[PDB]
Amino acid sequence: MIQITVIQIDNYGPWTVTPNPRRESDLQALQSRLYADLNLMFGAHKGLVFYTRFDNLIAITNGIDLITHKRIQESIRNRYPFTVSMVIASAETPYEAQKLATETLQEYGSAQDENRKEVLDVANELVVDGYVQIAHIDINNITGTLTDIVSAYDTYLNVNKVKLALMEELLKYNALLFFIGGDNFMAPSNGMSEEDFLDIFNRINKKYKIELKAGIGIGRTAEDASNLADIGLEKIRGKLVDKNVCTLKQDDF
Amino acid sequence: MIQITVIQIDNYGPWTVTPNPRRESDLQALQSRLYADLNLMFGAHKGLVFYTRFDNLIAITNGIDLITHKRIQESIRNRYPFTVSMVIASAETPYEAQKLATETLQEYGSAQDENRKEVLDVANELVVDGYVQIAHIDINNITGTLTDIVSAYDTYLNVNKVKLALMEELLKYNALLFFIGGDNFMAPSNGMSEEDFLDIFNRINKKYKIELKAGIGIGRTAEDASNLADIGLEKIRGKLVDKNVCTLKQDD
Amino acid sequence: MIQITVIQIDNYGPWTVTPNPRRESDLQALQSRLYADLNLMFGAHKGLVFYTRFDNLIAITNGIDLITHKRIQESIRNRYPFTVSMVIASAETPYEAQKLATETLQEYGSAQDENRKEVLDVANELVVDGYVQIAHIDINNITGTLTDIVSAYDTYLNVNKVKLALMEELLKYNALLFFIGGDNFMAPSNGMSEEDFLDIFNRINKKYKIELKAGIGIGRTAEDASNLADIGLEKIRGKLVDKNVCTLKQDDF
Amino acid sequence: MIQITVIQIDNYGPWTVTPNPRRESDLQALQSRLYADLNLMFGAHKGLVFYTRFDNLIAITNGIDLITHKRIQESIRNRYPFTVSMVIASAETPYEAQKLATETLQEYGSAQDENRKEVLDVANELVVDGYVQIAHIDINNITGTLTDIVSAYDTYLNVNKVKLALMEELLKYNALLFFIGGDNFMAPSNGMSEEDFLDIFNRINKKYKIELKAGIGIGRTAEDASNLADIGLEKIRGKLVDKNVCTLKQ
C-alpha cells in the first residue's frame, strides 16, 4: 500500500502580510523555489512531490523514513524565512492516506497557530512492503489541435476544464489527480484497473472532444512507478500497443 | 493599454523524451526554477509572470522594452538545456493582448519545430502611455472553514472548483485569472469596475457557499498595480472600508 | 569614473549559531544561492557581482540607480532569513571607490549590530558619465599542463598561488582581483594600460613558470566592459593579435 | 578511512566560448547554482561539497554508494546545459584519496574531450568502516579587528593570505583546506592531532598577527564530523574549554 506525506508551511498567512504586504513576484519565486527544493531532496530518496496549493503540498514517500523527513525539515528551516510541518500516513488508497495524515496534523493545531511549528508525526505506520501505482495521463496531439491554433489563454482554459473533470471522476475511486505541466497530469491510483480509465476517458471525450492516453506504472517507490508510467506512454506513441492505456510492473528484482 | 508578453519553451515536448524520458522530480524542479527566475528577472524591471502551463507562460510587461526582453532570453539560453521564444502585444483588454501575441508567435512556426528557436517580436506596439489593473482575490476565512476542517485534498478540490468558476465568469469581461497559492487568485482586468466584481461574487457565493473579497489596484506597471491591490485587501480586513471590494490608484 | 556597491549580510555571525549551529551543506547552498540571485538581479541591469567573502560582496554598478538598489534589497528581505546592507561610491579607481563605500557603511555601525539593518546610502555620488575597464585574465593551456596531469587538489593550490600574486601586484595600481572559476580572473582596473599588464605577466611567468593572457574591455557598464574583455581573449587565441594582451572599446555606431 | 569524490564538468571549456563567449553574470549564477544543488543532494545523504575551482569540485562521501552517485549525476544531466563525471576513492589521508580518484579520472581522458562524458568509477573501494575528521578553523574577532576597521577589499586580502598560508602548512600532513565564507575554513584532516594544529597556529600568528581557533570533529560521515566540529567551536567561545582547539568524537 501507499505512504503519503502532507507538508504545510507553518503560520504562513500572517507572515505574508506582516508587517506589510510583499511583492507578489518575490512570493512566486519563494514558493516555486520551495517546491523545486522539495522535489530535489525527496527525489534524492526516490520520492515525488506535487505542488497542490503551494502553502500545502502532497508527496508520495514509500520507503522514505522519519529521520530522512526530519533532515529535509531541518534543511528548510536553515534556508527559508519559515518552517514546515509534516505528517505521514499509509493506507490502501491515496485518498485514505492523505485524509489520515491531515487528521493528525489538525489534531496538533491550526495552520495559523504561531505556537504550532514543525510538527512531524506518523498517523498510523510507515509502509514496509507496499507499492505505488501512478497513471501518467496526457492529451493526444495538443500541439496540432490547440497550442498552434488557439490563443495561449484558451489552451490554458481548456486544460483546466479537463483537469477538474478528471479530479471529480477519479475521486470516486479514491484516486488523486495533479497537473505537472503542458497537457500532462499524474494520478496516484492504487486499486484502479485499465478498464476504469477507459471508462473515464470515454466520458471526457464525449463532453470535451479531447482524446486522452495513459501509461500506468506499478513499483516499490514513486520514482519507479512514474518511470514505468513514462515508458508506457512511449509504447503507446510507438504504436506497439493497440489501446490508449498501457500498464507496466516493476520486476527487476 | 496593457502590454502582455507570451513566453514559450522551444521544442520542449521532444526534449523531455529524447534520447529517453526523464525523471519527473527533475522536470518539476527544472520547470519551477525557470518560473522563479522569470519573476526575479522580469520583477527586477517591475513585471509579473504567471505559471500558466509551465511550458507556456503569460507576463504583464508594461514599461519593459525589447532589448530587456532580449537580455532575459539570452540569460535563459546561457543557463538551461533549452531556449524560449517571446512575443509582445498591447491592447485595451488582457484577453485581446495575449490573443494578438499568440497569433504572431504562431506565424513564425510550430511549438514543436526545432528550427523555430528564440522568436522575439512585437505583434503591434509597445505601450508608451498605458496602465495595468490587477484585482487580487481571496476567500474569507479559508483556515476556519476548510484548511483546519477537511482533508488537504478536499480543500484543493474546492479551491480548484472556485478557480474555474472565476475563469468562466471573468472571460465575458475579457479578463484573465491565475492561481497564486493558498486561497489567492490574480485577475488582470482593465475595463472592469467594482460593481462588475460584486456581481460575479454573489453568484459565486450562491453557488459554492464561499465568500470572496478583492483589492483592485490600478497603476503604470504590473508591480505598482499588484502592490496597490494588496493594500486594498488590507483595508477590507481592517474595516477601513465597508464592502468586499476596494479600488486604489497610483495618484490617490 | 567607476561605481562600486558594497553589500553586507546584516548581523550574520550571530544568526548562524542562534539558537544552535546550522548544518554546513545548508549554509553553502544558502550562500551560493544569494550570490547567484544578486548576479541575476544586478545582471538584469547590466551590473556584475563578485563573491568576495560571501557575507561581504563587491559589485560594479555603473548605470544602476538608488531606487533599483532598494528594490533588490527588498527582494532579499522577502525570500531569505536575513537582510542586507548596501553602500554605493564612485571614484577614479576601483580600490578608492570600495574604500569610500565601506567607510560610509561603517559610520552606520557594526557588522554585528542587530539594530543596524538594511543600510542603503551613497558615499559621494552616483556616476553620471563614467566608464568601467575590466581585464579578463586566463592561464594558457591549463588543461595540458595541470588539469590532465596533476591531482585535483594540486591544480587548486597552483591556481590559488597565482591568484594571490596577481592580488598583490594589481593593488599597487589601485585595481582589484577576483577569481571567477577555472583558471580565470577578473580585474576592475580603471587607470591601467596594456604595458602595466605585460609587466605584471612577465614577473608572474618568471616566478611561477605559467603563461598569462588577458583581454581588456572598456565600456559604460560592467556587462559592456566584460563582454568586450571576452572578445579580446578569443582574438588572442585566434592569433588575430600578436601579443598576450588585447584592448577593445565600446562603439555603439 | 576517508572516501572522496572528485566531480568535473565535462568538456566545459569549449562550451563556455562556443559558438560565442557567454555573459559573465550568467556563468557565475550557473556555477553557484550547481554548487548549491550538489550540497543539497549529497547533503541529503550526509555528504559535503567544497567549491574548489567551480569547474572541478571535491566532496567527502563516506557512506554514499555508487547508485546514489549515479542518480545525482542523472539529475544534473536532466537540468543543466552540461554533464558531470565523478570518480570515488578511499585512503587514510584526504590528500591521497583525491590523488587516486584524479588519476583514474585522467585514465578515462581529457577534461576537454567530447567523447568522455559522465565517467562514474571507483578507484579502489567504497569505505565500509571509516571515519572523517574535519577541523573547522575560524579567526578570533574578525569583526572588531578587520571587518569594521579596514576596507572591504583589505579584509578580503588578509583572509586570502591566511588561506594560502594554511593550505601550504596543512599539506605537510596530507590535509586539505577550503574557504567556506567569512573568516571560516574547513580541513578534512584525518591523522592530525590537536598539537599539530597548535604548532601551525603559532606560525600563522607570528607571521600575520591573526589568532585562530578550531573545533575538530570525528564521525562516520561528513555531516556528523562537521556538526561535532561546530559544537567544538562553541565550547571555545563559551570559555568552557581552556585552549583554542577542541575535539569531539561521535
Ligand SMILES: Nc1nc2c(ncn2[C@@H]2O[C@H](COP(=O)(O)OP(=O)(O)OP(=O)(O)O)[C@@H](O)[C@H]2O)c(=O)[nH]1
Ligand atoms: N511534466 C511533464 N510534462 C511533459 C512531459 N512530457 C511532455 N510534457 C509536456 O507536454 C507538452 C506537449 O508535448 P507532447 O505531449 O509531446 O505533444 P503532443 O502535441 O501532445 O503530441 P503527443 O502527445 O505525442 O500526441 C510539452 O510542451 C511539455 O510541456 C513529461 O514527461 N512531464
Ligand SMILES: Nc1nc2c(ncn2[C@@H]2O[C@H](COP(=O)(O)OP(=O)(O)OP(=O)(O)O)[C@@H](O)[C@H]2O)c(=O)[nH]1
Ligand atoms: N500568492 C500569495 N498567496 C498569499 C498571499 N497572502 C496570503 N496568501 C496565501 O493565503 C493563505 C491563507 O491565509 P489567509 O488568506 O490570510 O487566511 P484566511 O484564513 O483565509 O484569513 P482571511 O482571508 O483574512 O479571512 C496563506 O497560507 C497563503 O498561502 C499573497 O499575498 N500572495
Ligand SMILES: Nc1nc2c(ncn2[C@@H]2O[C@H](COP(=O)(O)OP(=O)(O)OP(=O)(O)O)[C@@H](O)[C@H]2O)c(=O)[nH]1
Ligand atoms: N568564469 C569563467 N570561467 C571560464 C570562462 N571561459 C572559460 N572558463 C573556465 O576555464 C576553464 C578551462 O578552460 P580553457 O581556458 O578553455 O582551457 P585552457 O586549457 O586554459 O585553454 P586555452 O586558455 O585556450 O589555452 C573551464 O573549465 C572553465 O571553468 C569564462 O568566460 N568565465
Ligand SMILES: Nc1nc2c(ncn2[C@@H]2O[C@H](COP(=O)(O)OP(=O)(O)OP(=O)(O)O)[C@@H](O)[C@H]2O)c(=O)[nH]1
Ligand atoms: N561557512 C560558515 N561561515 C560561518 C559560520 N559561522 C560563522 N561564519 C562566518 O563568520 C563571519 C563572522 O562571524 P563570527 O566568526 O562569529 O565573528 P567574529 O567577529 O570573528 O567573532 P568570534 O569568532 O567569536 O571571535 C560570519 O559573518 C559568517 O560569514 C559557519 O558555521 N559556516
Ligand SMILES: [Ca+2]
Ligand atoms: Ca500529449
Ligand SMILES: [Ca+2]
Ligand atoms: Ca483568505
Ligand SMILES: [Ca+2]
Ligand atoms: Ca585558459
Ligand SMILES: [Ca+2]
Ligand atoms: Ca570568527
Ligand SMILES: [K+]
Ligand atoms: K502579495
Ligand SMILES: [K+]
Ligand atoms: K517524465
Ligand SMILES: [K+]
Ligand atoms: K556550521
Ligand SMILES: [K+]
Ligand atoms: K564570459
Ligand code: NA
Ligand atoms: Na504532454
Ligand code: NA
Ligand atoms: Na489568502
Ligand code: NA
Ligand atoms: Na579558462
Ligand code: NA
Ligand atoms: Na567565522
